[model samples]
Structures are given as structure tokens and as C-alpha cells.
Target chain A: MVSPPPPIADEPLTVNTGIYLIECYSLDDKAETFKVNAFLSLSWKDRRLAFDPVRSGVRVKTYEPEAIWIPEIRFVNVENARDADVVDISVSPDGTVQYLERFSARVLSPLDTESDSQTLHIYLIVRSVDTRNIVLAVDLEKVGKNDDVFLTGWDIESFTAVVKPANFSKLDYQLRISRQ
Target chain B: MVSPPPPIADEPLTVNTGIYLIECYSLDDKAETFKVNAFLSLSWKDRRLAFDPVRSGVRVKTYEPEAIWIPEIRFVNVENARDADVVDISVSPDGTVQYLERFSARVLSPLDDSQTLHIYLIVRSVDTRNIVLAVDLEKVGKNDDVFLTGWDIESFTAVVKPLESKLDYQLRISRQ
Candidate 1:
């Protein structure tokens, strides 16, 4: 079955500086899906700012109004599927359904060894509106040794697109009145 | 009477990403006179930027590397044995400086009431090095109407302040 068409809006929804979640599901299988959790903030003077997860606050960088470049996505593994391989599927920006990366990993188990599973994580940094309308996808395919198929699953998260309001008040008649 | 000491550089000279000026002047009289006529242009962010009064071929509004705002200044016309009046000044990021009202009237009248004779046009917008400096100032007199002078010059000219390079290569590496 063909996927449904994406939704579009003439104007963006006005929102204050904060975080948002954009989500999407696979047209073929709801169990296989992806998600994007993004943080958005606004400051004065068109300056570029970023959220430091370590510090828990925003840091002012250069002034960039047109576009903000986020870092590449990353993943880590913990004790779980020792012989299982993890991969990222895709990423979407508008919370609409889209594909980004494909995930396929093979597992190897040694004799008399206890197999442990691995945990995967991805981080994204976005700076400008130009980077919006993005989506991420991930698929976990298990290819066991000796051409054996074990378990296959998919985990996806998304962040909704958020439009930040202009930080300062508009140049209204009240603000324009000169004191002189 | 001696004038106040010239403004010292409080920070490194880093241009904002927009239009800017490097104005030079020499005092001719003690009654708070301001004489300005020199201009300088230097390359920034791989773009050739200059503030020359005689050159009209330069682009005024283009891709600026630095954060540039509208340029403005304020002045007081200290007429001999007459009451002083506050006047606003205008500067384009491209290198055009004129009395605010003179441009509005569309005529260059040196004697126009809008022309200030005492105060000078300092820096326009603040660069990385010149923050906290006066975008506007007030003039205090011992005995008079006590005119409050400040600048409300609109943003007309465009400028590009580059984010790259801090020290002038020739002025630093070569000069030494």
C-alpha cells in the first residue's frame, strides 16, 4: 500500500521558546517507526544559541539568522543483545512520515558465552528553521550466525516542529515613540 | 580649555557582521569643534570593505559577515553667543555621512538649521571592540536651556561584518 500524502500549513503555529516532539510511523507496519525529539529556543539580536545538555543551560554563539547546523546523530550500546547489531533508520523534521537511515546488524556468539543485548541512542542539534521538516528512521534486523534468523524489531521517536516567536516585541506605535 | 581624552580601545577590534566606519578627525578650535574628513577601507572575511568618501562604486548593501545595525550619531550646534540646539547625524554603512535633516530635505546646505557645528560623528553601531560606548550622549551646560541631545538616526545603509580574522595581518605580522 502507498503511503498517505504529508500535511502542509500555510503559516506556522506560533510557539514560545521550548522543546517539541515530531513523530512518524511506518506506513506498512505501525510496529516499525521513528521519532525526533528536538529543543527550540529564541534569543535577542538574531544571535545563534545552543542547548548544552551537560550544563543544562543555553550558550550564546555567533549570530546566525538563516540556518543552524546540528551535529551528526550518534548511538551507544549497553548490556543487552551481546551478539545483536543496532542501526539508525531515518530522521524527519515536520513530524511527517519519512525515511532517513536503514538498520541491519549481524550477531556472533562464542561457545559457552552468554549473549548480551546492546542499547542504542541518537542525539541531534538544530540551530535554524532551514533545518526543519526533518525525520529519522531506525530498523533493527538480527542476522544470527550460521544463516540463522533470531529476532527483529524497530524503535522510533520523533519531535514535533515548533516555530519560535520573535523574542522582542514588534515595533509597534508605542515602542516607536521617541522620548526626545 | 583642553578636551576630554580620546576614547580608548576597551576591547579587541572585531567588526560586527554588517556595515561600519573608521573615521579620523583633528580638532581645529577649543569651543568643542569637530573636524572629520579622512576615510579608510580594509578587507574583511575575504570581502573588500572600505569607507572612502570619494568612491561611489562600492556596494552599500550586500552580504555582511558581521552583525550590523543602523548607524546614528547626535550633536549640538554651539553657535557663538547663541543658544545651542541638538541635531541628529546620519552615517551609511557604505560611507555616506550627512546631517539627518539635510538628507530628508534632499539638499546639502551646510548652514541649514539641522547641521550641527559643534559635535562630531563618532562610531555608528557597536562592534565587538566598541560595546558599551555611546550610541548617543547628552550635553550638560552650566547655565542654559540644558538641551538633551541623542541620536535616533534610522537604519538606511547596509554593511557586512565578517566573523573571521581579528588582527589585521599587515598591521600586525608584517609591521613587527
Candidate 2:
């Protein structure tokens, strides 16, 4: 269970990643950092986990995180390790794995300093192998923050991802904020 | 190897942890936070990684951070994530791993009386498991110039006790 799902026919494994911000605060202008609480959602296919729905009866099975091989997805620009707790792990009969975790971390990102409004960029990366082993992509629908979540001193304009070619390993998102 | 070295037959996997402060600044009084740059050092033994030096022809082997399982070590009370980059990963013939990383972080610790502060370190893994780290007192220290301008640092110490999995680092600072 420690090994990742073997590549199926030489194709790269794609992990769909999305972030839903629950709370955002402490936008430090001087340090160019911000604090955020969010749910990290990841989905992938693992052939080893496929099961016969007719025989299993259950449409989806839940498994402890330790029982399966989960990709090591991390916020590459954060300080220390990200404080995260697994929220759920469910597997569909066809072997699609859905992993969700709620995490909080101080993100170190660059912000536009001289502009009237600032744009911050957050980068998430898979510390495992390169695109040959895994590919990280943005789940557009899941790239957003809660309506109530706000950075105390700034007005959040938008939180979205800028999809780039998969030639690189990390996924980047932009958060635009303006002074209150 | 995704699996951390199996618990040595029921014994806890003890990772030796240490931090050497490099630079400290941005003592934000209103936010009760400070910015720090430091090197995080971690060591552990993974039996599966053990190799024969004679056969391999090398005393130590270097590895990419992703080649093997590295414990998820994090600061419990940082603002967002610890901005870090892997510096080195070396494995000895005995499967001993030495991990070093340079990191920058905005620590959101309490600044009591706008002076004293406490930092907590936690190691985590999935599957209802707990990973504990041993404090390497010899390596637990800060640079002489750690404090920010106009501030005098009086004490910097780490308190390690029998907590299931954590280290308490206390720093006392005062205005000059």
C-alpha cells in the first residue's frame, strides 16, 4: 500500500487538486504572507483498488488513509509543515480515490507592492516524482474561497488558478485583494 | 518507499529533530508574530534503506527528497505554511537518514507582554499514527544575532518532555 498505483500503460497519473478556503486572515504586508484555512481536495484513480460493485454491494468504500497510497501533495512555499487533518477518503467501485483534508498554514507568497490592489500567488506541489510519475491539475470548480471568508484588513477580490501547461510540477493560484 | 520504516517491532520511530536559527526579524506587535529563517535538521533510520557500503562502493548515498519517505515535520502554529526547500538528503550504509532544509516562516506565536514567545513543533503522519521526534539539544540553538533591531534577546530554550509528540521552544525578548 506504500507504493503508488502503477502507471497504466505508460501514461502519467493525474491527480486533480482543488482548494476551498474556509477562513483567511492576517495579511502581513511587510512579510508578504497570509494565513488560510481550507479544504484540500484530491482525486485520482488506483487500479489496485478497483472492486466489483455487484459483489461488493456498496457503491463506494471508505478506507483509512494509511490503508492506501496517497500522493504527497504539499504547499511548497509554506513555512514549516502544513497543519492538516484528513477529512475523508472514499473509493468508488472503479477505483477512483477521493481524498479530502482540512488544513491551515501560513503561506509565503509574493504580493504586488506598489499597485493599488495586490495579487498573491500560492503554489502547491507534489514532492514525489516528476510529471512522469504524477501530474497535478486544477479542478476549476473547486478553486474558490467561502463567501464568508475574508482577510481582516483587505477586501478579497478573487481567488482563482492560472492553468499552465503540465510541463511543470507545481500548480499556481492567484488571490487578488485590495485595501479596505 | 511510501511506508515509513515499519515500527521496529512495536518501538516508536524516533526522528531526531533540531533547528538552528539563521535570521530573525519583523516582530509584529499587533499580530504577535515574527519572521524567522532557519535550518531544519531531521534524522531517522529506515531499515529498508540500509545498504552494503562495500558492495555499493560508497559510504553514503544522496537522494532526492522524493526518493524515500520523509516524515511530515511541521511547526504547529505558523501563519500559513513553512516556506521550505530541501537542502540535502544523505543516507548512510546503516539506512540512517539525514535531512536538512532551509526554511522561512512567519511564526504566529503568542508574544506575551509584547516580549516573550513560544513555538511548538509537531510531526505527523496519516492512518491514525503518531510520529515523535527526539530533541537534539546539541543542535537546538539560535544565532547570536537572532533578535530584531531595538530588541534584546534574553533567553532561547527548547523544552522537551514526555509529550506524545511535540517540542516547546520558548524565547524571551525585550526592548533595548
Candidate 3:
């Protein structure tokens, strides 16, 4: 057996748990492509959650348990990394991206009451601009700026989320079961 | 020496990969508590990717390429075990949690993008939260998950010879 060494003072983003990371892909023609005007939708019967920006926490939305969709839009990756005159994206000093989605939210069709599942999507219009060109509205908060979040492994009680592939749609990725 | 056990199919989720599940916490009394967030956000830079919906193929966007924050937001884990009414998470028809984040991009914050040596560092708070802990792995292969060592707090530096640290604990279960 090897003799151990000394301990460190700080470990910033070390995380381990019974948790799972489902790295879903939103678009990949396996061709020259960049996924824009994209959105993902997840559907479930009942669950509750809440977001506490102060503590950087997202707790269960106990009151609105029936709400099936995740409540916002965000970015994803594209691999065959084909460069077109893509939506010239810029990054903020705080590490946020300028996808030029000044009107990203508005362009997306509101949740269709007609649809079978509670749907949501993130829109970015790339590819052939003269083709569709998604509209936009609502900007996302720079929630990704939190640099000090960490998770531990040995927890007793925890909730669950379902990654059903059927409820996902219309993006550059499968968005649901796309675990690389 | 005791003979090692045979590897089984349907491996457990203990393996480490390019994947990371970011679960934030709330109400750290300095006591003991875990947190569950109401939501999470997925972010990534430009990298055209794909998943075969028919077969659920999240290939191409492996660790060598994109660092997917999640192609989309899903649930992750939170330790501390707080009493904040948490979200009720569940697995998929395929055992995936609704909290699952399928990020296919190699895009996490570029804190040390200039980091030449690929070492996975862990941060443990001793907070509102506490100290976090981490250790780098031997560069990942397409298949191997992890190399387990039963090291305790001070022993962390043993793995990284050219490394040096204070105030850290052993592995969680090792505490018991």
C-alpha cells in the first residue's frame, strides 16, 4: 500500500452523487451545420419545482406540481461543426453568449394548448436565413455565472426527473435521450 | 491477493466521463441540509450536434469534442440533505431522470481554458455550503470509467505526485 500525502485547502467544483447527467444533443445532420432557432420540450404528469436565485437553488415547485415543462430556453452543442454564415455569436465578459437572440423568445410559438404534451423550445434561426428566420423575445438571465456550486455523493433523500424521448421535438438534437 | 471480481454488463452509474451534473444547493445551516432548485439552465457555445431519435444515439458529441452543459436542462443531484420541499424526480422509460441534462458540448466556463494539463479538480467547502473536493483522472479512454483508490483526506495528494494541500475529509462513505 502507498503512504498518503497531505490534504488541499479548497476544491471548487467537485461533485459526485447518485445523480445522472443526460447530455442530450439537439442537432446533428452529421453535415456542416450549427443548430439555431432550437428548443426542447419535456412532458410529465406531475412534479413541483422553484428557483431561488439568491441561494442559487431550484427547489420543488410544490404549488404548481402539474406543470410539465421546464420553464425556460438555453443553449446546446453541435458537433460536425460546419461553419456557415452562422448567427455570429459573441460571449459576455461573465462567460455568457450573445446568440443574437434579442428576439429569441418571441419568435418561438407559445405552448400549444392543442399539443398533447406541455411543450417548450429555444429558438435560434441559422442555416438558410431566407428560409424561416426564427423570431425572438424574452432574454435569459446569466444564471450560468455561478462559479461556486458543488455537490456531494452520500445523500439519503432526493427527487427524480424523467428523460422521456417522446416528448422532445424540433431542434438540432434529440434533446431528450441524447446522452453522449 | 484476492482475485478481482468479473466485470458485469449494465454497469453502474459510478463511472466518470466528460459529463457533469450541476446540482446547486440551498439552506446550508452550517448544520446539515441539501437543496433542490426549482429549475436549471443549459448553456453551450456553437457546435452542431445530433442524436438519433430512433435509437437515441448521443454520439459524436463525446468528451473529445463538445462539453455539453446539456443540450437542454434536466435534473442533477444536490447533497447536504436540507428540508426544503424538493422536486420529485423520476427515471425514464429508459431510466433517465426528468432532471437529466443531455449536454453534448465541450463548453463549460473557460476558467482555465488555458489549462494545458487536463486534471479534474474538486472543490469542497468545509457555506451556506462547505468545502468541495476533486482529483484529476488518468486521461479518459472510450471505455474505462474510473480507477478507485481508498484514500482519505490528507492522502488526496498521493494520486498527483507533483501536487501538494489542508482541512479536507476522506471519501463520503469512508467517513462512516
Candidate 2: true interface contacts recovered: 0.10
Per-model TM-score, in order, reads 0.15, 0.55, 0.19
For every model in order, the fraction of real contacts preserved is 0.00, 0.10, 0.03
DockQ of each: 0.01, 0.08, 0.03
Cα lDDT of model 1 by residue, B115-162, tens digit:
232232223334432422222111111111111112112211322223
Q: List chain B TM-scores, each candidate.
A: 0.18, 0.88, 0.18
State each candidate's clash count.
54, 14, 94
lDDT of 3 by residue, B29-145 (tens): 331332211112112222123234347632222221122212211111223221221111222223222222322212111111011112222322222212212222321111111
The model with the greater lDDT, 1 or 2, is 2
- Which regions of candidate 3 deviate over 4 angstroms? A1-35, A39-41, A46-180, B1-116, B119-176
Please give the TM-score that candidate 1 achieves against the real structure: 0.15
Expressed as tens digits, the lDDT of each residue in A83-160 for candidate 1 is 212122121222221112232211111111132332222221221122123222211121012211112332222212
Put down candidate 3 lDDT per residue, A1-180, tens digits, no spaces: 011111233222111111121111222121112123222222111101223434644322222212222112233222212122222233222222232212111111121224333222322211111111222222222111111111121111222222222122113111111111
Per-candidate Cα lDDT values, in order, are 0.21, 0.76, 0.21
